[PDB]
C-alpha cells in the first residue's frame with residue numbers, strides 16, 4: 001500500500017491582504033484538488049490542543065443515562081426531532097464508534113427555519129452543564145473558530161478556480177449555515193468485536209467503507225493515529241496523520257458545481273485498534289443556497305449542469321450515506 005501525496009499548505013495568507021500571496025496558496029489548493037484531493041492546512045490559527053483535550057473526556061465522562069437523554073432518533077424513538085444533532089451511541093460487541101453531532105448554535109426556537117420546521121435544521125441538545133462544565137462553551141466557540149478557518153479556505157478554493165474570493169464564502173453565513181461538527185471517539189477494545197470490522201473488496205479491514213463526503217468541503221482534525229485512505233486509479237493510498245494540521249478535501253457539492261474538475265475524493269477509514277479522535281467540520285451552505293455550475297476546463301467556462309439547492313442536496317446526501325454505509 002502506497003502513500004498519498006498530501007501537501008502541507010500554509011494557509012495563513014488567506015487571512016490577510018497580500019493578494020499575490022493568496023494566489024500562491026490558491027495554486028497549491030488547485031494542485032492538491034486535481035491530484036489526490038486532500039491537503040493539510042497548516043499555520044491555521046486554531047488551538048487544536050486540547051480541542052483534543054476534550055473533546056475523549058467529554059467523551060470519557062458521559063454516562064449511559066446521559067447518552068440516552070441526548071440520543072438521536074435512530075437510538076431513541078422519543079426524540080423524533082433529532083435526526084442530525086445529538087449523541088450516536090456505540091453498541092458494545094457490534095459497533096465501536098460513538099459520536100456527538102451539533103449544528104449552527106444560531107438555530108434556536110426563534111430562528112425562522114426552526115419555526116418553519118425546515119428539514120436539516122435542528123436545535124442543538126447539550127448535556128447538563130454541571131456534569132460537563134465548560135463543554136457547551138468550548139463546543140460553540142470551536143464551531144465559530146473552525147467556521148472562520150473554513151471561510152478563509154473557501155476564499156482559496158474560489159481563487160483556485162478563477163473566481164473572486166467570495167464566490168463560495170458569500171453563501172457561508174453564521175445566520176443560516178447547515179455546517180456540522182462531529183466529535184467522534186474510536187475506542188481501543190480488547191477483544192475488538194469482529195462484528196464492528198468490515199472487510200473491503202481488497203481485503204483491508206475497515207471501520208467505515210468508501211464514500212464521497214456530503215459537503216462543499218470537509219475540514220478535519222484527527223488525533224495522531226493513521227487511519228484514512230484515499231482511492232486513486234492505482235488503488236487506495238494511506239493518508240498520513242498530522243495532529244497539528246487540518247485535513248481538507250472537497251465534497252460532492254463541489255464536484256457537482258465544478259463539472260467534476262475538483263472531484264470529491266473517495267476515501268475510507270481503516271480499522272485500527274487504538275483510542276483516537278476524529279473531529280470533522282462539514283462545510284455546508286444555507287438551505288436555499290444555489291451555486292451556478294461552471295466548467296473551468298472549457299474555454300467559455302459553461303456547464304449544462306443544473307444549479308442545486310444546497311438544502312435538498314444535503315437531505316438527499318445524508319440519507320443516502322446512511323443507507324450505503326450504515327447508521328453511525
Ligand SMILES: CC(C)[C@@H](NC(=O)[C@H](CS)NC(=O)CCC[C@H](N)C(=O)O)C(=O)O
Pocket residue numbers: 084085101179180182184208211212213214220269278279280282318321328
Ligand atoms: C473521517 C471522518 C470525517 C469521520 N467520518 C465521518 O464523519 C462520516 C464520513 S465523511 N460522515 C458522516 O457519517 C456524515 C455525518 C453528518 C452529520 N451527522 C450531519 O448531520 O451533518 C470518521 O472518522 O469516520
Ligand SMILES: [Fe+3]
Pocket residue numbers: 211212213267
Ligand atoms: Fe468522509
